[PDB]
Point group: D3
Chain length 165, copies 6
Amino acid sequence: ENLYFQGMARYINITLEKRGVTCKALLLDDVAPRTSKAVWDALPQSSQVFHGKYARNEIYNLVPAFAPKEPGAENTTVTPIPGDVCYFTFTSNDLKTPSHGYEQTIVDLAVFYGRNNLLLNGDTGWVPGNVFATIVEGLDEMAAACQDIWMGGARDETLTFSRAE
Amino acid sequence: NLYFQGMARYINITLEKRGVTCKALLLDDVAPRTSKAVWDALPQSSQVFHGKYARNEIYNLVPAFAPKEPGAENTTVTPIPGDVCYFTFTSNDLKTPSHGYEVQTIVDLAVFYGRNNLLLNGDTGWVPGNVFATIVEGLDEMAAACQDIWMGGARDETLTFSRAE
Amino acid sequence: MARYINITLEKRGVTCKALLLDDVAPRTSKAVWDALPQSSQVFHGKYARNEIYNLVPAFAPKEPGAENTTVTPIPGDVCYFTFTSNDLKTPSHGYVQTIVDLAVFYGRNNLLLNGDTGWVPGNVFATIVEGLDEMAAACQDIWMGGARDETLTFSRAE
Amino acid sequence: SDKIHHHHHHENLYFQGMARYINITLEKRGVTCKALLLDDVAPRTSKAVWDALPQSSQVFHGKYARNEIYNLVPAFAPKEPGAENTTVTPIPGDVCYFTFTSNDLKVQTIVDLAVFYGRNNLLLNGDTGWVPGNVFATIVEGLDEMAAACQDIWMGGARDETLTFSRAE
Amino acid sequence: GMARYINITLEKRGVTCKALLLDDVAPRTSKAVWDALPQSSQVFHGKYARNEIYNLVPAFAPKEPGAENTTVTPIPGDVCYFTFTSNDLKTPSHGYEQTIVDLAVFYGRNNLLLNGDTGWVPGNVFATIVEGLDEMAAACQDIWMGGARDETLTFSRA
Amino acid sequence: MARYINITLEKRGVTCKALLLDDVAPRTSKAVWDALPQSSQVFHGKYARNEIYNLVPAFAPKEPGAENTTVTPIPGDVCYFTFTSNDLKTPSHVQTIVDLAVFYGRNNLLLNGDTGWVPGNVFATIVEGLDEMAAACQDIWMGGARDETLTFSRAE
């Protein structure tokens, strides 16, 4: 049935390198085929982690665009739930702004570790993310590591997405 | 019981660990009940938190201190740089899975250091805050310190509101 | 038996007629009808879009509470809002007692949503059944030509 | 801290040890799922509902909240729980409690007991704006089968269909 | 040019209403649809936009009209056109049992075209129901309570 | 070097001065600056609250696209929106039209019932005369916009 990968379920590891916490997520080859393939083909992807300021129970990284073509809207949400792993296509203009306050095409790879989140901000309104993976192992530990990023900072911390094989 | 204020009053807002203070004009004329409730009870000091949904926000949480809560007064759901806000909450509002902190009335005293903020969450929808002060000196320095809380954490950091005199 | 109200711009001399929604907004309909006429300075909405309204002191023995509410008012809607002094006397607004906002929606694609508190539902208590086009034109003229010396008056239709 | 960690762990075991469950059943289609009552985070609402079970009434599919079915019953608690563990973004498996009046839905107090069977839902309508629900249970068995039944309510209708909340043995 | 009208029909229930095609304010969408009528497919009741029924058909215009006369607050009697892709619709969040067009009828009020997939979903308002709205609304409530099995929504030239 | 624009209501004779945000909105700032002056019939906002604006045919060789956007504009913001005739020639209220807007108060939402959120490019911030401009905008709200013209020009 699946558009691209038609074998047994594939999985990605999602790792905070400094804290050394990893969880594992099912790749949604069925309902997000283009986003899943774009990410999978490009793994590993690893960069400075950030805690969300508006989308709530969220951590994410920012990487240069990697796919030959961006997937476009696919399996989108503006109400991400615990365990969602999301992909966003942004431009420099979207992110390099006073409202963001950080210290080409950019991809945001995000993990939602809690509930009651809205992908909505005062820059543009709604910001839907492609849901392309779902955490199936280690979610509680990841959530605890993310609360520690919120309270204890993201200095020298790196979020890495890799193939679990 | 008008509790008239004929001259400008100011509060200092200080991050103790980082050692950064800014000064705010108290909005005695447009937020008289809130301004009094806060003024009369200063200093108020507690662990700082960075917002997860309201964006460019830091705040602390203290036990109710006023003889009676001010109610809605000079409210915003679009807080701006320099806004200092007061929120009345109950334990049920805050002690939630969606908040993920590490019946009683609790006051949130918040500082908005940047723009493009929405006081909206996935617990209840809009969460209006009473705007009761506006930062008139040291906003840039405070904004820099708050980005350092976002990136460097809030461990052992304390937000303190005090009378300037 | 259906009851109707007249809604009039005194200076422009434009009136329309509305059916009072006694069936689905009985408490609001009664509160208003019993107190008519109600007349005051007109204002054009700055956030709710195709709206004019007035502001009057509370008139009912007790406020109706939420009833037949909308945050998506449509052309022809007549709405009632209960506010306090704190709601209206703000910098955001640029104009401890209870105030009633009586509102006419003359066009579509309106949201009763503002940056002070978020959603502001109105009780929909009447629907304009005659002279909506003319009223709409007069409201556009309030938008472009101002509200100076203009009064919005609600009255019982005979 | 080690103290906090251990406390959390202890608290979780306690609530596991006294876990109670409710059955949620569509009577005509004959489909039941089981939900854990959230005595830890929604103690007031969980009690108010447990105490009054069973509760059973005509089912409705939501028209604004999306992947939702619900019933409406007269108020049953001696006092309403008030806002507790609320969401405006309900998720698959959530079971929600709302207090309404006759004016909200058409002066009587009515309870809306709701099951969310899919995702990407917003508890927001054109009458009042946001309508938060108290999340008081989470479906732990039969969610897929319940979701398939709810889709069939959506396409096939709610006629003669009853939604029943009951205590699980 | 003279007013053109369309009939909107539920084939199983046998209920038809008539709408004025909005050639003046939605000319591209009005043309796209008129030229391609009849359009007829399985009916669905909305799950998020409230008092809505609709069908889904393959794209039929030589080119899509694009945003025209849009609303996210549709009102009773609105007929709306949306352009979607299979990605917008074939989702877990939709739970249904390429360019696709959604032709929608709004039979009641207090509707928001807003969902948890993408946020706001504006529709092009291209017709307004002028006869039979009350009967259609009653049929649509009956789709809600009684289901959509073997029911077909048909748009045709009047 | 900082560049400044004057924003003037011609009939009321009220002018304020705005810093052009060449750092954070370079494309929009250049597009506007290179086309000044721009001057047209003033309107008060009906949805974005504490707002006046004008509408002018597109002037730039190419539209800036999204840049430094807000849906929560604040006092002193000057915003740029690119619209088509379809966006604006509606009952609710193709050629490319630009809306140049001044926000004179707070608690504004750039959100409407036509399309939802309508982000504006923030390209200048009023640094002098805001109080006077706000009083004049309140007078447009109460006293109308007839024969009133909003003019954006280079400060000498």
